[PDB]
Design an enzyme around this catalytic site. Structure first.
Site, PDB file in Angstrom:
ATOM      1  N   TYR A 143      -3.349  20.410 -13.628  1.00 25.55           N
ATOM      2  CA  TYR A 143      -3.742  19.565 -14.485  1.00 25.55           C
ATOM      3  C   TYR A 143      -4.704  18.409 -14.120  1.00 25.55           C
ATOM      4  CZ  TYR A 143      -0.665  22.189 -17.420  1.00 25.55           C
ATOM      5  OH  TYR A 143       0.079  23.450 -18.131  1.00 25.55           O
ATOM      6  N   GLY A 198      -8.042  16.914 -13.673  1.00 25.89           N
ATOM      7  CA  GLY A 198      -9.378  17.516 -13.798  1.00 25.89           C
ATOM      8  C   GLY A 198      -9.300  18.546 -14.635  1.00 25.89           C
ATOM      9  N   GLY A 239      -7.601  21.239 -15.507  1.00 30.47           N
ATOM     10  CA  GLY A 239      -6.395  21.157 -16.467  1.00 30.47           C
ATOM     11  C   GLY A 239      -6.366  22.738 -17.050  1.00 30.47           C
ATOM     12  N   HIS A 244      -1.591  13.001 -19.515  1.00 25.32           N
ATOM     13  CA  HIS A 244      -2.895  12.451 -19.810  1.00 25.32           C
ATOM     14  C   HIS A 244      -3.768  13.426 -20.832  1.00 25.32           C
ATOM     15  CE1 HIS A 244      -7.114  11.119 -18.545  1.00 25.32           C
ATOM     16  NE2 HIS A 244      -6.732   9.882 -19.156  1.00 25.32           N
ATOM     17  N   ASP A 245      -3.772  14.673 -20.242  1.00 29.12           N
ATOM     18  CA  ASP A 245      -4.316  15.927 -21.032  1.00 29.12           C
ATOM     19  C   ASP A 245      -3.799  15.913 -22.434  1.00 29.12           C
ATOM     20  OD1 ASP A 245      -5.767  16.262 -18.806  1.00 29.12           O
ATOM     21  OD2 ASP A 245      -5.061  18.234 -18.620  1.00 29.12           O
ATOM     22  N   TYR A 290      -5.152  12.606 -24.325  1.00 26.04           N
ATOM     23  CA  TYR A 290      -6.541  13.037 -25.028  1.00 26.04           C
ATOM     24  C   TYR A 290      -6.452  13.885 -26.184  1.00 26.04           C
ATOM     25  CZ  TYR A 290      -8.991  10.569 -21.342  1.00 26.04           C
ATOM     26  OH  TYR A 290      -9.764   9.768 -20.202  1.00 26.04           O
ATOM     27  N   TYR A 304     -14.599   1.914 -23.084  1.00 19.75           N
ATOM     28  CA  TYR A 304     -13.599   0.888 -23.518  1.00 19.75           C
ATOM     29  C   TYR A 304     -13.832  -0.348 -22.743  1.00 19.75           C
ATOM     30  CZ  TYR A 304     -10.708   3.175 -20.100  1.00 19.75           C
ATOM     31  OH  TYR A 304     -10.427   3.655 -18.953  1.00 19.75           O
ATOM     32  N   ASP A 339      -5.753   6.159 -20.547  1.00 20.30           N
ATOM     33  CA  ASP A 339      -5.927   6.173 -19.224  1.00 20.30           C
ATOM     34  C   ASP A 339      -5.312   4.896 -18.443  1.00 20.30           C
ATOM     35  OD1 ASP A 339      -8.338   7.942 -19.888  1.00 20.30           O
ATOM     36  OD2 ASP A 339      -9.835   6.201 -19.408  1.00 20.30           O
TER      37      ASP A 339
HETATM   38  C1  IMN Z   1      -4.113  18.769 -24.213  1.00 24.32           C
HETATM   39  O1  IMN Z   1      -5.445  18.968 -23.128  1.00 24.32           O
HETATM   40  C2  IMN Z   1      -6.762  18.356 -23.213  1.00 24.32           C
HETATM   41  C3  IMN Z   1      -6.960  18.376 -24.618  1.00 24.32           C
HETATM   42  C4  IMN Z   1      -8.432  17.757 -24.629  1.00 24.32           C
HETATM   43  C5  IMN Z   1      -8.979  16.994 -23.708  1.00 24.32           C
HETATM   44  C6  IMN Z   1      -8.201  17.116 -22.312  1.00 24.32           C
HETATM   45  C7  IMN Z   1      -7.042  17.837 -22.152  1.00 24.32           C
HETATM   46  C8  IMN Z   1      -9.191  16.236 -21.277  1.00 24.32           C
HETATM   47  C9  IMN Z   1      -8.461  16.277 -19.990  1.00 24.32           C
HETATM   48  C10 IMN Z   1      -9.030  15.524 -18.748  1.00 24.32           C
HETATM   49  O2  IMN Z   1     -10.392  15.295 -18.340  1.00 24.32           O
HETATM   50  O3  IMN Z   1      -8.172  14.642 -18.136  1.00 24.32           O
HETATM   51  C11 IMN Z   1     -10.266  15.898 -22.052  1.00 24.32           C
HETATM   52  C12 IMN Z   1     -11.464  15.395 -21.297  1.00 24.32           C
HETATM   53  N1  IMN Z   1     -10.129  16.348 -23.210  1.00 24.32           N
HETATM   54  C13 IMN Z   1     -11.225  16.133 -24.029  1.00 24.32           C
HETATM   55  O4  IMN Z   1     -12.113  15.335 -23.607  1.00 24.32           O
HETATM   56  C14 IMN Z   1     -11.375  16.356 -25.524  1.00 24.32           C
HETATM   57  C15 IMN Z   1     -12.662  15.873 -26.015  1.00 24.32           C
HETATM   58  C16 IMN Z   1     -12.965  15.923 -27.333  1.00 24.32           C
HETATM   59  C17 IMN Z   1     -12.243  16.779 -28.200  1.00 24.32           C
HETATM   60 CL1  IMN Z   1     -12.949  17.126 -29.806  1.00 24.32          CL
HETATM   61  C18 IMN Z   1     -10.996  17.471 -27.816  1.00 24.32           C
HETATM   62  C19 IMN Z   1     -10.621  17.287 -26.237  1.00 24.32           C
END
Ligand code: IMN
Length: 121
Positions: A27, A29, A31, A47-48, A51, A64, A89
């Site tokens: 997960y 990076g 993920g 964290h995933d 987000y 931010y 974060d």
């Molecule tokens: C539940 O799993 C997710 C879902 C979305 C995620 C990530 C992990 C990570 C994981 C990460 O890089 O740590 C990022 C960056 N996600 C997004 O950026 C993102 C951006 C815009 C929309 Cl509309 C939806 C999601």
């Protein structure tokens, strides 16, 4: 933003986000799938999910502001998205710090095929 998050990670842990946390386990990076490999990877799973609670925010690019109150991270007031991205974060960086004692280099560059399955947030 990812660059800020990388700095927060380095500040907290003394490890560079890339490469210590950018390709770790299932997960951290890229993920996606599988049972997280260890506590650090679980930080990344959560964290995933964090987000994922924010489908109309853009955490990679939206910056931010936060400060340190002695070592504590305090997210400062911005837009709603920025506040929420910061709290995600912050939690991850604290989680990485709390789990440094079990961090394992063998999970860096972990292969996708060893990460299989659901695991709902
Ligand atoms: C539940 O799993 C997710 C879902 C979305 C995620 C990530 C992990 C990570 C994981 C990460 O890089 O740590 C990022 C960056 N996600 C997004 O950026 C993102 C951006 C815009 C929309 Cl509309 C939806 C999601």
């Amino acid at each position: 933003s990812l660059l800020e998050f990388g700095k927060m990670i380095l500040e907290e842990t003394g490890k560079l986000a890339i490469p210590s946390y950018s390709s770790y386990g299932c997960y951290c990076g890229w993920g996606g799938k599988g049972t997280p490999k260890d506590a650090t990877d679980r930080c990344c799973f959560v964290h995933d999910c964090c987000y994922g609670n924010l489908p109309d925010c853009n955490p990679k690019s939206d910056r931010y502001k936060y400060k340190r109150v002695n070592g504590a991270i305090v997210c400062e007031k911005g837009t709603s998205c920025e506040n929420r991205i910061c709290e995600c974060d912050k939690a991850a960086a604290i989680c990485f710090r709390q789990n440094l004692n079990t961090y394992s280099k063998k999970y860096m560059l972990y292969p996708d095929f060893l990460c299989k399955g659901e695991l709902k947030c």
